[PDB]
Design a protein around this ligand. Structure first.
Ligand SMILES: NC(=O)[C@H]1CCC(=O)N(Cc2ccccc2-c2cccnc2)C1
Ligand SMILES: [Zn+2]
Length: 139
């Protein structure tokens, strides 16, 4: 689990969104595994606006942060799970590292801020849904 809080927005994995996230929906993209809902409290996370390919992510299944190199956001084939059939997920970044389904929502950060959240894994890889292109999150 996990979310990003910036201004009056809450960014979560679309497959983990609650009834309240859907009742206050701002934007959702199944191909990205992202959903953004509105909040009454002001969030103060900082989103990165950069093209970094190195950062640190939180891994709940190890209670640890790990430094990783990751690929730029791209269209990657993701095996079926109970939430989606097998499909291509867009704006996804991969790194070599540990990830389990319950790790989804863990933040990846670079020196400029939040880069994205854990969204895929298995086979010794960890996949992050990018948020750096969502410039409206800051306005
Ligand atoms: N964005 C998505 O389509 C996700 C929906 C929910 C979901 O469980 N996954 C698979 C997954 C996520 C995180 C860590 C590991 C795995 C996983 C484990 C075992 C073998 N393959 C994948 C994909
Ligand atoms: Zn950066």
């Amino acid at each position: 689990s996990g979310a990003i809080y910036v201004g009056n927005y809450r960014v979560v994995n679309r497959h983990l969104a609650t009834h309240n996230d859907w009742a206050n929906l701002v934007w959702e993209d199944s191909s990205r595994d992202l959903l953004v809902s509105s909040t009454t409290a002001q969030g103060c996370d900082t989103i990165a606006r950069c093209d970094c390919q190195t950062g640190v992510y939180y891994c709940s299944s190890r209670r640890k942060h790990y430094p990783v190199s990751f690929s730029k956001p791209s269209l990657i084939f993701v095996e079926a799970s109970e939430y989606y059939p097998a499909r291509y997920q867009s704006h996804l970044m991969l790194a070599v590292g540990h990830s389990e389904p319950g790790d989804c929502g863990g933040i990846l950060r670079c020196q400029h801020g939040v880069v994205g959240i854990v969204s895929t894994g298995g086979n010794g890889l960890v996949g992050f849904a990018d948020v750096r292109d969502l410039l409206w999150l800051d306005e």
